[PDB]
């Protein structure tokens, strides 16, 4: 639409929210493949931060490109590497969700604030395969990664 398309050129960072993400209960409903920042550059935030963020985007884009073959030829028809793209992307999607303090009237969960280093670490560990054994629902609506390891224990009864 002309109003928002013309606003993009006035910003230094953008956070784009999406009803298709909100609908799944993923809040904040940020589209991780359409949110940008002028300082997302290895020389500004460092190469570790930069590399993890790009690896999160890559796995989310690769999962998005397969969704419509999974749904039609089934997961069994997928390569094993494609299977890891899937389980890990789906966990990364949930780990990007977060209980906000101002949103407790809506989530029924206590709000969380996650320091930059804990964010980087949690995502680097998921990409590396450290949590291929935990169920998806463990990464949904939590703060730090330790909270997902504990939810996995809780869920396991």
């Amino acid at each position: 639409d002309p109003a928002p398309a013309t606003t993009f050129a006035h910003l230094d960072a953008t956070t784009v929210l999406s009803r298709a993400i909100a609908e799944l209960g993923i809040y904040p409903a940020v589209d991780p493949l359409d949110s940008t920042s002028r300082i997302m550059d290895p020389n500004i935030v460092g190469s570790e931060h930069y590399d993890v963020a790009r690896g999160v985007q890559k796995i989310l884009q690769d999962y998005k490109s397969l969704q419509d073959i999974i749904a039609i030829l089934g997961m069994d028809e997928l390569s094993e590497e494609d299977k890891l793209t899937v389980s890990r992307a789906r966990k990364i999607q949930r780990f990007l969700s977060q209980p906000f303090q101002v949103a407790e009237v809506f989530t029924g969960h206590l709000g969380k604030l996650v320091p930059l280093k804990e964010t980087i670490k949690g995502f680097q560990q998921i990409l590396a395969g450290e949590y291929d054994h935990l169920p998806e629902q463990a990464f949904y609506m939590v703060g730090p990664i330790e909270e997902a390891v504990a939810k996995a224990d809780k869920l396991a009864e």
Binding site: L24, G25, E136, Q137, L155
Partner: protein
């Protein structure tokens, strides 16, 4: 709130996972619950319910007491269960209504009502 607190996000995650789905144990439990809460939120027209009665019905599903009941029997359970509580446990319902809350005691009371009634109904 004590019974509906996190149900909305849970149901939205359930719908996504039902469409996507050797399912792991957490996925299976998420499916078993959402399929059942879905039945519990069905309602006919022209008989809007008092709040304490809605609480008692939802309690049954969100505390896990119907997870082994066949999904097609949920609506009939709910109708029988509500008649029973209204008929024999008015006090309990009045307490939830008047305290505007589920006390520790109202909770112990509901639990035996549900489990014993459920075993009967399943007979």
């Amino acid at each position: 709130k004590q019974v509906a607190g996190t149900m909305k996000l849970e149901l939205a995650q359930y719908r996504e996972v039902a469409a996507f789905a050797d399912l792991d144990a957490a996925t299976q439990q998420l499916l078993s619950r959402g399929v059942r809460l879905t039945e519990l939120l069905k309602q006919g027209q022209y008989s809007p319910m008092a709040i304490e009665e809605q609480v008692a019905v939802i309690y049954a599903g969100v505390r896990g007491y119907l997870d082994k009941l066949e999904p097609s029997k949920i609506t009939k359970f709910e109708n029988a269960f509500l008649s029973h509580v209204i008929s024999q446990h008015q006090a309990l319902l009045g307490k939830i209504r008047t305290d505007g809350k589920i006390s520790e005691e109202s909770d112990a009371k509901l639990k035996e009502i549900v489990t014993n009634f459920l075993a009967g109904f399943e007979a």
